């Protein structure tokens, strides 16, 4: 009562005070992890935007952007999946530029191979014409 | 006795309440940290796609480049053949006027 209780209440104060300290430590720890995890994402985003600017997908109205906004903004504390939500804004127009490119590459390779076969045809015709000229040559001079 | 005992009774609740607030904030950052792996992966996939776009644009330019060179070759070879066929015909005529 005057001691048993009071003293038991004191030991609870002592325990709970150390328990609070441990939780204050855990919070600060997790805060710094989140900060490091962020910075790592901002660093990767800076590399993506650097190259995007090089390919002129950025800034807005860049000549290789087709009018899309390829800029991505990461803000402190965003709901679960801050960047996955950009899939419709940035990812589906990007895969569009990719498939338009590979198709245009297949049309170009189709044209190239056609020009290549035309050239081998001409080599065949030029080589046979040179033979005839050399043959008729000898026959004319044989007379 | 009830004066200090109440103070200690309030101190325990003040401590238990403070603990509950720190755990709450800790869990918010805990959940946020758990979502950053997905954010890291997303930026990786975007860097891949941009690099793929870059590489394929280089490939297209090279093909278009050489395709234009082959057009110049066809043009030249078409002249060489024209000349040869003209010479061929002339000698066929020379054979007759022998």
DSSP string, A80-120: S-TTGGGIIIIIHHHHHHHHHHHHHHHHHHHHHHHHHHHHH
B6: three-class secondary structure by DSSP: helix
Structural domain total, chain A: 2
CB B60 within 8 A of CB A95: no
Query: Domain segments of chain B: what residues?
Result: 1-98
Residue A82 inside a domain? The answer is: no
CB spacing of A136 vs B92 below 8 angstroms: yes
Query: Where a domain ends, among A77, A100, A130?
Result: A77
CB A94 within 8 A of CB A70: yes
Query: Where a domain ends, among A56, A77, A98?
Result: A77
Handedness of CA A77, A80, A84, A88 (dihedral sign): negative
**Crossing angle between the packed helical segments B2-96 and A92-142, to the nearest 10 degrees:** 20
CB pairs under 8 A between A and B: 178
CB spacing of B5 vs A108 below 8 angstroms: no
Residue A72 inside a domain? The answer is: yes
3-state helix, strand, coil in chain B (%, to 5): 95, 0, 5
Give the other-Cβ count within 10 Å of B63's Cβ: 18
Among A6, A20, A112, whose Cβ lies nearest the Cβ of B4?
A6
Query: Where a domain ends, among A51, A77, A103?
Result: A77
| Full residue range of the structural domain in which residue A131 is found | 87-143
Residue A56 inside a domain? The answer is: yes
Minimum CA–CA partner of A106 in chain B:
B60
- For this entry, resolution in Å reads 2.0
């Amino acid at each position: 009562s005057c001691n048993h209780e009071r003293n038991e209440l004191q030991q609870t104060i002592n325990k709970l005070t150390k328990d609070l300290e441990a939780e204050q430590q855990k919070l600060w720890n997790e805060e710094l992890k989140y900060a490091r995890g962020k910075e790592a994402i901002e660093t990767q985003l800076a590399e993506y935007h650097k190259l995007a600017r090089k390919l002129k997908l950025i800034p807005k109205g860049a000549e290789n952007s087709k009018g899309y906004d390829f800029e991505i903004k990461f803000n402190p504390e965003a709901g679960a999946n801050c960047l996955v939500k950009y899939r419709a804004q940035v990812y589906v127009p990007l895969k569009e530029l990719l498939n338009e490119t590979e198709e245009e590459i297949n049309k170009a390779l189709n044209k190239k191979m056609g020009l290549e076969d035309t050239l081998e045809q001409l080599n065949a015709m030029i080589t046979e014409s040179k033979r005839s000229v050399r043959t008729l040559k000898e026959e004319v001079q044989k007379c | 006795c009830k004066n200090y005992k109440e103070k200690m009774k309030d101190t325990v609740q003040k401590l238990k309440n403070a603990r509950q607030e720190v755990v709450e904030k800790y869990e918010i950052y805990g959940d946020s940290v758990d979502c950053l792996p997905s954010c890291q992966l997303e930026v990786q996939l975007y860097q891949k796609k941009i690099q793929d776009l870059s590489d394929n644009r280089e490939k297209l330019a090279s093909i278009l480049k050489e395709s234009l060179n082959l057009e110049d070759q066809i043009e030249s070879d078409e002249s060489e053949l024209k000349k040869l066929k003209t010479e061929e015909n002339s000698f066929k005529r020379l054979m007759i006027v022998c």
